[PDB]
DNA sequence: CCGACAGGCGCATCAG
DNA sequence: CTGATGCGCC
DNA sequence: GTCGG
């Protein structure tokens with residue numbers, strides 16, 4: 292499918308090992324940055340030396356590319372693939388609510404399969420129970436057609452609670468993707484700003500629960516909701532898969548920093564925020580602030596557009612669709 | 617010789 | 633109960 | 643694991 296697919300799959304596979312098994316989050320980030328920059332690279336890689344010229348590709352990854360180009364495989368990945376404890380820790384992380392730490396603890400106590408998870412539901416917290424319950428469904432992708440139906444429902448139900456709410460579907464959907472992993476809703480309301488909860492998120496969640504769109508809750512606070520949703524199914528047909536849904540209530544005046552973050556992609560955001568540091572700024576979902584001599588953020592800069600944030604760090608403006616891999 | 621590596625919400629655990 | 637720290641996730 | 647350096 293892809294030009295350097297073998298290379299990027301390998302580096303992605305190695306990344307997952309370092310994150311899930313070794314618990315080295317920055318090694319995982321290094322492999323991702325290496326995979327990302329190679330993916331965009333428009334030439335077919337003929338050697339490890341050619342790859343090392345790209346930023347984020349060093350001596351060790353170059354050698355691994357040489358081994359991959361020569362033999363068509365990696366001995367390190369063979370060793371990891373065949374190791375049972377590694378595979379079990381790597382598998383359990385795919386369940387929503389289980390990360391590297393918990394997965395390891397489960398494997399130590401003889402829990403290595405879905406069978407073992409379902410038989411030992413008592414050992415799992417609420418977040419994890421739901422992730423286990425809809426395991427197969429959360430693995431599936433959401434067609435854009437279904438994302439449009441989900442958008443129609445959420446916007447209509449949000450309007451019915453209050454006409455001054457504005458909901459925006461971000462994520463890969465806003466980047467014009469054919470499919471998505473889940474729905475990401477960015478919410479605002481005039482009553483909530485950075486200068487001044489009133490149950491603003493609750494009322495929207497409650498109304499979406501009331502009409503049976505939202506089926507479960509993984510976690511829920513005043514600004515951030517995290518849970519499960521499902522489209523209405525017709526008569527005599529199989530039900531739609533249960534889908535992950537995130538709703539985030541960001542202050543109305545800080546919408547553009549918010550929508551920038553939640554539009555993505557993830558590696559794009561990491562690069563932008565990393566580039567902001569080198570330019571002497573710091574970016575979060577709320578603001579863009581200048582860094583002091585000791586790395587202390589100053590007062591928020593005036594942001595009106597998404598482009599404004601790009602301008603401060605001398606970046607050519609990329610439309611949502613140009614922020615993918 | 618290290619350090620930094622994006623940044624923060626919700627939830628959980630520990631020491632006091 | 634705080635405050636510090638860590639987990640899982642976005 | 644890479645860059646900074």
Ligand SMILES: Cc1cn([C@H]2C[C@H](O)[C@@H](COP(=O)(O)OP(=O)(O)OP(=O)(O)O)O2)c(=O)[nH]c1=O
Nearest residue numbers: 462463471472473552553554555556557560642
């Ligand atoms: C997971 C993750 C998300 N994000 C941001 C970018 C994402 O667009 C946003 C939440 O979107 P996600 O639903 O996490 O991912 P996505 O929508 O980009 O891709 P998919 O279609 O597979 O769901 O938050 C990060 O900056 N870093 C991360 O590690």
Ligand SMILES: [Ca+2]
Nearest residue numbers: 293330331616
């Ligand atoms: Ca590509």
Ligand SMILES: [Ca+2]
Nearest residue numbers: 343344345348
């Ligand atoms: Ca390089």
Ligand SMILES: [Ca+2]
Nearest residue numbers: 384386387389
């Ligand atoms: Ca998980």
Ligand SMILES: [Ca+2]
Nearest residue numbers: 462463472473
């Ligand atoms: Ca998404």
Ligand SMILES: [Ca+2]
Nearest residue numbers: 473474475537
């Ligand atoms: Ca999401």
Ligand SMILES: [Ca+2]
Nearest residue numbers: 506521524530
């Ligand atoms: Ca049902």
Ligand SMILES: [Ca+2]
Nearest residue numbers: 595596598599
């Ligand atoms: Ca402007």
